[PDB]
């Protein structure tokens, strides 16, 4: 019920943006009274925030634990790129699209700003271990985020979350991330990443 | 000096910062310091400004794209030249107009002309990449790498990289290098010089 509201909001937000989407629409979408929607969320902003943090917080949490494991920076970067793409392909709607909406810059979303900055730092720091003080160090994060422009957005999960395999696109973008750094692909990257995903 | 270009600049600012729905023509007119009556002379609606904005921004990219795609060099040189020149374009403007592509509103039928221009641009990238990598999902990557500059540049009215005949912007070179690297394709000889001349050639 709570998750149904979030799903419908995700669709409306990613399709219409923030400003035009109304609570009336969200409530109508899930087929409940607006009073009933209010029980669940006080404002569309709180909904928008709830979506936004459920989307990146799992990445940042996972990011520091994998950035701090016993491999090399090539492997750690490959794992974080692959895990992040894995996440972005695991949702019914393309919630990553929400980052691009002008509203997210506002002070209300300071919690997201911090989490996004933290993730960006992880990508950049790992990358600089490989290429040093080099502008290419910015690239792995953007390469990772480009999946948001590649995946569908129609209510069907492009790649259901799996512990047994990585999505082709996840592997591709992770391979691309090292190629751009001129770093060779580490041995047994996928299996290790899957193990590095589990902890 | 240039009333129509000032209107577009201010609109570019307001739209990228506020989105489409909340931006008003009153704000745009106030921004450039003219009466709304005077603004109405140049543009009838917010939707039309948004189109003129998108169309002054995407057509030169598509024209540039299809002109570089048809020249007797190798697919690597053409792809490199088009990536660097397209990033150069996106870095040459007072405002980050590339951010506009990301607004959900542009998907609507009213912006069908932008859709085709974008499709044509995307096809030019894809065809070049497939000449290099064949039936391979990596062929999708150079276009997205190119567009990633939209997430890199400033957006405050100051041009990140003023247009130049002597040089290419660092970020333009980097993204073009990156576009070939992901394809496993070698960097062409004299990439910058070769590209700058092709840009000069393109009038």
Automatic annotation (TrEMBL), chain B:
- Which terms are listed as keywords in the entry? DNA-binding, Transcription, Transcription regulation
Top-level taxon: Bacteria
Query: A single Pfam family, by name?
Result: TetR_N
The Gene Ontology terms for molecular function here are:
DNA-binding transcription factor activity; transcription cis-regulatory region binding
The protein depicted here goes by the name AmtR protein
Gene that produces this protein: amtR
